[PDB]
Amino acid sequence: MEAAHSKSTEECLAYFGVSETTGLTPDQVKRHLEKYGHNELPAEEGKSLWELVIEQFEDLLVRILLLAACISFVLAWFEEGEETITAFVEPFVILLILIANAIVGVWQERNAENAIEALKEYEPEMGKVYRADRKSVQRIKARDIVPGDIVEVAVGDKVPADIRILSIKSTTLRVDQSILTGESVSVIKHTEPVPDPRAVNQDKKNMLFSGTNIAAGKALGIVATTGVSTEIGKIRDQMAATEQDKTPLQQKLDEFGEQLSKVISLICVAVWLINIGHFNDPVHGGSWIRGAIYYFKIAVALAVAAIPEGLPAVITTCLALGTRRMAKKNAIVRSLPSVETLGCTSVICSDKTGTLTTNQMSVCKMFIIDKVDGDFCSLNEFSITGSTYAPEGEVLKNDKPIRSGQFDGLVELATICALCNDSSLDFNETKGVYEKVGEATETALTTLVEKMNVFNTEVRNLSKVERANACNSVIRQLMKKEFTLEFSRDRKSMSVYCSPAKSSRAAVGNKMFVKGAPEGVIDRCNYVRVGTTRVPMTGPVKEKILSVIKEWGTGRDTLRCLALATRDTPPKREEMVLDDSSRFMEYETDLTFVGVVGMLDPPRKEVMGSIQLCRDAGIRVIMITGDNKGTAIAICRRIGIFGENEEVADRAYTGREFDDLPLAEQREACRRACCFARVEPSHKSKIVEYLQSYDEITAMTGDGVNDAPALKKAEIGIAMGSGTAVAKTASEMVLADDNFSTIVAAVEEGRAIYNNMKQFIRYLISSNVGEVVCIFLTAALGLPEALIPVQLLWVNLVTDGLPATALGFNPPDLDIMDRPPRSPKEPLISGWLFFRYMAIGGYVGAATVGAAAWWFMYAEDGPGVTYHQLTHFMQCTEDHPHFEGLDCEIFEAPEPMTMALSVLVTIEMCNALNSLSENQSLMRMPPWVNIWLLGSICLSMSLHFLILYVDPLPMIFKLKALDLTQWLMVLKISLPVIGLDEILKFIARNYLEG
Ligand X SMILES: C/C=C(/C)C(=O)O[C@H]1C(C)=C2[C@H]([C@@H]1OC(=O)CCCCCCC)[C@@](C)(OC(C)=O)C[C@H](OC(=O)CCC)[C@@]1(OC(=O)CCC)[C@H]2OC(=O)[C@@]1(C)O
Which residues are annotated as catalytic?
351
DSSP code of 797? I
The Cα 611–Cα 641 span in angstroms is 7
Query: Which of ligand X, K ion, none sits in contact with 739, Cβ below 5 to 8 A by type?
Result: none
Q: Do residues 449 and 418 touch, judged by C-beta distance below 8 A?
A: yes
- Angle (CA) 848-854-858 rounded to 5° is 170
Helix (H) or strand (E) holding 525: strand 525-530
Name the minimum Å distance from CB 557 to ligand X.
Answer: 53
Instruction: Catalog residues that contact ligand X under the rule CB under 6 A.
Output: 252, 255-256, 259-260, 263, 267, 306, 765-766, 768-769, 772-773, 776, 827-829, 834, 837-838
Query: Which of ligand X, K ion, none sits in contact with 148, Cβ below 5 to 8 A by type?
Result: none
Q: Which lies closer to ligand X via its Cβ, residue 12 or residue 779?
A: 779
Name the minimum Å distance from CB 687 to K ion.
Answer: 15
Name the minimum Å distance from CB 301 to ligand X.
Answer: 13
Name the minimum Å distance from CB 521 to K ion.
Answer: 42
Beta strands in 342-479 (DSSP E): 347-351, 362-373, 376-384, 395-397, 400-402, 425-428, 433-436
Name the minimum Å distance from CB 857 to ligand X.
Answer: 24
Q: Which lies closer to ligand X via its Cβ, residue 616 or residue 826?
A: 826
Name the minimum Å distance from CB 700 to K ion.
Answer: 9
Query: Which of K ion, ligand X, none sits in contact with 263, Cβ below 5 to 8 A by type?
Result: ligand X
Q: Do residues 438 and 421 touch, judged by C-beta distance below 8 A?
A: yes
Query: Which residues are 529's β-sheet partners?
Result: 534
Name the minimum Å distance from CB 768 to ligand X.
Answer: 4
Name the minimum Å distance from CB 255 to ligand X.
Answer: 5
Query: Which residues are 675's β-sheet partners?
Result: 623, 652
Nearest by Cα to 851 from 902, 900, 906, 788: 900
Name the minimum Å distance from CB 304 to ligand X.
Answer: 11
Q: Give CA separation, 989 vs 637, 917, 918, 981, 993, in Å.
A: 42, 12, 10, 12, 8
Burial 557-570 (b: 16+ CB within 10 A, else e): bbbbbbbbbbbeeb
Residues 6+ apart with CB under 8 A from 649: none
DSSP code of 396? E
Residues 6+ apart with CB under 8 A from 697: 341, 344, 345, 346, 347, 715, 716, 821, 824
380 burial type by CB count under 10 A (0-12 exposed, 13-18 middle, 19+ buried): middle
Q: Which amino acid is at 910?
A: C
Q: Which lies closer to K ion via its Cβ, residue 247 or residue 423?
A: 247
Task: Fill in the per-residue mask, 704 to 733: x = in contact with K ion (CB under 5 A), - = not in contact.
Answer: -------------x----------------
Q: Which lies closer to ligand X via its Cβ, residue 640 or residue 770?
A: 770
Query: Which of K ion, ligand X, none sits in contact with 252, Cβ below 5 to 8 A by type?
Result: ligand X
Query: Which of ligand X, K ion, none sits in contact with 256, Cβ below 5 to 8 A by type?
Result: ligand X
Residues 6+ apart with CB under 8 A from 309: 65, 97, 793, 796, 797
Q: Do residues 5 and 199 touch, judged by C-beta distance below 8 A?
A: yes
The Cα 205–Cα 194 span in angstroms is 7
504-509 contacts, C-beta under 8 A, 24 or more apart: 508/568
Task: Give how many residues touch K ion by CB under 5 A.
Answer: 1
Query: Which of ligand X, K ion, none sits in contact with 772, Cβ below 5 to 8 A by type?
Result: ligand X
Nearest by Cα to 959 from 908, 916, 899, 903: 899
Name the minimum Å distance from CB 844 to ligand X.
Answer: 12
Q: Which lies closer to K ion via its Cβ, residue 710 or residue 910?
A: 710
- Among the residues of 16-139, which ranges form H helices? 26-36, 49-56, 60-75, 89-109, 115-119
Query: Which residues are 652's β-sheet partners?
Result: 675
Burial 513-528 (b: 16+ CB within 10 A, else e): bbbbbbebbbebbebb
Q: Which lies closer to K ion via its Cβ, residue 691 or residue 977?
A: 691
**CB 412: neighbour CB atoms within 10 A?**
23
Q: What DSSP string runs through 648-682?
A: -GGGEEEHHHHHTS-HHHHHHHHTT--EEES--HH
557 annotated to a ligand binding site? no
Q: Which lies closer to ligand X via its Cβ, residue 269 or residue 923?
A: 269
The Cα 209–Cα 164 span in angstroms is 9
Burial 665-693 (b: 16+ CB within 10 A, else e): ebbebbeebbbbbbbebebbbbbbebbbe
Nearest by Cα to 607 from 639, 649, 650: 639
The Cα 683–Cα 119 span in angstroms is 21
The residue with its CB nearest to ligand X is 263
The Cα 517–Cα 566 span in angstroms is 14
Name the minimum Å distance from CB 305 to ligand X.
Answer: 8
703 annotated to a ligand binding site? yes
Secondary structure of residue 221 in the 3-state scheme: strand
Q: Which lies closer to K ion via its Cβ, residue 488 or residue 698?
A: 698
Binding positions for K ion, rule: CB under 5 A: 717
Binding residues for Mg(2+): 703, 707
